[PDB]
Amino acid sequence: KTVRWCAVSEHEATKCQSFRDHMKSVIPSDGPSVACVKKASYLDCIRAIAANEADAVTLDAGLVYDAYLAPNNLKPVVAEFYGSKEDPQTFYYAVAVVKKDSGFQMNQLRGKKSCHTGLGRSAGWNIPIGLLYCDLPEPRKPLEKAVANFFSGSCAPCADGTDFPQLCQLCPGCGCSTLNQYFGYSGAFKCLKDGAGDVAFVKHSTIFENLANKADRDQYELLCLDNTRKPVDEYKDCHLAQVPSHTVVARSMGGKEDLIWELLNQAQEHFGKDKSKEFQLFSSPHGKDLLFKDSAHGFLKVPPRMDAKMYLGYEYVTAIRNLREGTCPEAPTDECKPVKWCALSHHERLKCDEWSVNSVGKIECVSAETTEDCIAKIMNGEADAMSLDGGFVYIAGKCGLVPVLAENYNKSDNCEDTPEAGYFAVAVVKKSASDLTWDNLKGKKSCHTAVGRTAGWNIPMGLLYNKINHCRFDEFFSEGCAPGSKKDSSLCKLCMGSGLNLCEPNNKEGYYGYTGAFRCLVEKGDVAFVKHQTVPQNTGGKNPDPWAKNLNEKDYELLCLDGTRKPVEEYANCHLARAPNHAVVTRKDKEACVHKILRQQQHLFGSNVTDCSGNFCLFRSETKDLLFRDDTVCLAKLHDRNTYEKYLGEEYVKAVGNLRKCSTSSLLEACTFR
Ligand SMILES: [Fe+3]
Ligand SMILES: [Fe+3]
Structure with missing residues (x-):
């Protein structure tokens, strides 16, 4: 067509x-x-x-x-x-090109004549006018008038010349196309070259496109943000912005x-x-x-x-x-607004609303149906913050978000001051069923917390991928439950969610999460990829729910990296890898705010609350890990580790990186586009 x-x-x-x-x-x-x-x-x-x-x-x-x-x-x-x-x-880079020996710096632009690619364009308008306009004298509105009065004549293609004559002074009529000789990157450059203007706001390649001789380009330079000037080929250290x-x-x-x-x-x-x-x-x-x-x-x-x-x-x-x-x-x-928390679907949304009520205006709630959808909302400002498994701390990082606090799980000295090395990713199997002992794992049935999570996916699939050297885990195992997988995948075949909830990476899928993956093992699977405290947490009546009320720790074992199968409590000598604690992430512009608000919130509703029936507890949610992991003791300071790389650490970053090919995550590709 x-x-x-x-x-x-x-x-x-x-x-x-x-x-x-x-x-x-x-x-x-x-x-x-x-x-x-x-x-x-x-x-x-x-x-x-x-x-x-x-x-x-x-x-x-x-x-x-x-x-x-x-x-x-x-x-x-x-x-x-x-x-x-x-x-x-x-x-590309937005630059400001000027003639060599014109004298003035970026902070000396008043009264100069300007050449712009076009009104509203990145290099030609948004970037440089963005840098100036807040220093412009009242009246700032309309912007065009203030800009017109600042320079002593401009060419601003697509501006309204009848309203703002000065903006078309160098190009009568401000024609919004290439029929206007001064339109666009090359038109604005020509505006400078002719001597109509003193400065051209264009991109880093513009001068090289218009002057092939170095000797001719030597007659020009760029204005740097630090009020110095540099040669036109030094744009990397002398540009106004990247766009x-x-x-x-x-x-x-x-x-x-x-x-x-x-x-x-x-x-x-x-x-x-x-x-x-x-x-x-x-x-x-x-x-x-x-x-x-x-x-x-x-x-x-x-x-x-x-x-x-x-x-x-x-x-x-x-x-x-x-x-x-x-x-x-x-x-x-300076303002510090309320924190818009992003809740994973309706289970979390309800807990979050109760939290909102109890915070008296400190916390607000927004919801989405997947962790990725929520991260995208934090990126764009629809939400501000959420707690994430390290696998999604990683993705959030690639998306430009930063970690602000860590969930801690070890009681309890000064928990907020004590950074933890991390929990353990283990592989849980049922005792006496039977020679399930790594190696011959092919064709078996697997349970995962969700696609993209540390213990549930990245760690085991990481180690698994090293062996088989292809990305088709859905046919390594015969079938399994791995919420977030393609709906037709065999890794959805074992999930328990009803109707359109089947294999959804949220609590509408009964096998989603640590506890859910354990339920998957108990009911359907051969192996559950979870954290080391999952079996203790869901046996011996610790989980009062009918499927778990009568389970007990003795019946499960751990798959060791060497083939051994030590019991559950020997996780420290029988784990797949260390997993960095889950962490709250947010945008850079809100990190200080979220930081402060969350510390006072956990002081109000943290793990030092009693009752939990009458009172609201931030770190309890039955068994579903709503908003935070249920075994969260407190949120702790990150100190130097306020970056996804620094926080997750070298080992885990490379381990996730090693799984870059294979990645199914549409958010990861989006955030990795530049
Ligand atoms: Fe552009
Ligand atoms: Fe985790």
């Missing part, structure tokens, strides 16, 4: 027609076609797409912000990359995303930089950056889990919003 590509002005349209013609000549008559829709600005394109008049357009990431808002509701679907195919970069790459956008909820990828992937295969055919994707005799940037080297599909907000990233989204609404944030660490 055909993708209607939105071209802005006649030069993009000419390249678009050649694109179309060359694709017809090269792909089967059944594959992807491209058609061309002409519009007068990227914004006309966004609206055309939202209205089903076109399907695709490439946007600078700042402009992706505009496209994602209602009523447009567009989303990134295919991203440009730069650098090379051998080293794909999905980001996400330009990306093709399409309608959310039905925008032909696979057709667009199929078209572009086949396109980069025939007309990419490595194929000097009659048609090139990434250049044109009719101008630069037409349809895609000349600096792009190819396309990468955006991960399905990665929505527009995650594509831009928390920091940049927040900066944009504040820029548009003209607001200058008065520090998150």
Whole structure:
């Protein structure tokens, strides 16, 4: 079927027609076609797409912000990359290029003439105006007026020149396309080169695209954030910011995303930089950056889990919003808001609400159906914090979140001051059934806390993967229960959840978690991958529930790494590995706040509460480990370990890394995109 590509002005349209013609000549008559829709600005394109008049357009990431808002509701679907195919970069540097010997530094921009790629764009507008606008004198609104009065003349393509004449002074009419000579990276650079402006806000590659001679480039330099200047090839140490790459956008909820990828992937295969055919994707005799940037080297599909907000990233989204609404944030660490806890489905949501009531406004609740969904919400600001198994502390880390406190399990000296080395991942088997002794584990039945968890998955599958050297655990074992697995997998066959709950990584799946995995072993499995205290915790009437009330510790043993099968209590000499304690994670901007609030909360409702029936206890939940593990003694300080690498530690990081291939996690791929 055909993708209607939105071209802005006649030069993009000419390249678009050649694109179309060359694709017809090269792909089967059944594959992807491209058609061309002409519009007068990227914004006309966004609206055309939202209205089903076109399907695709490439946007600078700042402009992706505009496209994602209602009523447009567009989303990134295919991203440009730069650098090379051998080293794909999905980001670039915003720089400020000036002429050598103009004198002024970044903090001396007032009264200079500025050249911008376009209003609302990353390098050309959001980054540099973001750096200046909070020092601008009242009235700050509208932003354009303040910017107009700051510089003594600008070219800001797509600005309203009738309202703000000074913003088009260097480019009358602020034309929002390449028919305006000063439009875009190369137009803004030309604005500086001609001597119209004194500064051009563009990307790190712009000058190299426009001046091939080093001797010519020597007449320019960059403005660094520390109010010094450096040569134009030193952009790595002299840039204003790093920003996400330009990306093709399409309608959310039905925008032909696979057709667009199929078209572009086949396109980069025939007309990419490595194929000097009659048609090139990434250049044109009719101008630069037409349809895609000349600096792009190819396309990468955006991960399905990665929505527009995650594509831009928390920091940049927040900066944009504040820029548009003209607001200058008065520090998150000064206000310190209530903590929005993310509860895993309704079981946790109910406990969290009780907590919310008892915290009298310190704690608020949000819910999601999986740990990944919750982490994504913390990333984007819908929630603030949650406690995570080390396997997801790892993923959260890759997603840019940091650990703030650790659950501790060892009573009780000064628990908050005493960091623990970690609990133990063990392999539990039923005594006298029979020669189940590692090695011949193939074809057996396995129980896991959930896909992606330390003791339940990463540790054993890690060790398992070393042997078999393929990623198909679902056919190493004959079947099992591993919540979070593909619903058709044999590793879902043993799960107990009803209807659509089957194999869900939450408590609606009865086998999810430490206790659930033990129940799986007792009822269905041959081996349960759990923590070392699970068997003691769920035997001898410790678990009052009917399935466990009459179980006892003597009937279970541990699988040793050497084939031995010591009893449960000898975990210290018979474990698969050490597991770093679960930890609370949050965003950097809220870490101090969450830290303080959580310490006072556990002082109110921690493991020093009595009753637990009348009173609310933060670290009890029957047997379900709601919000925190039930054997949590307190939340403890991390000290130097406020980073996922530093916290989890070298051994476990490499052990998880060793399982990078095999990973099924859609959030991991999303967070690992740049
Ligand atoms: Fe850009
Ligand atoms: Fe765990």
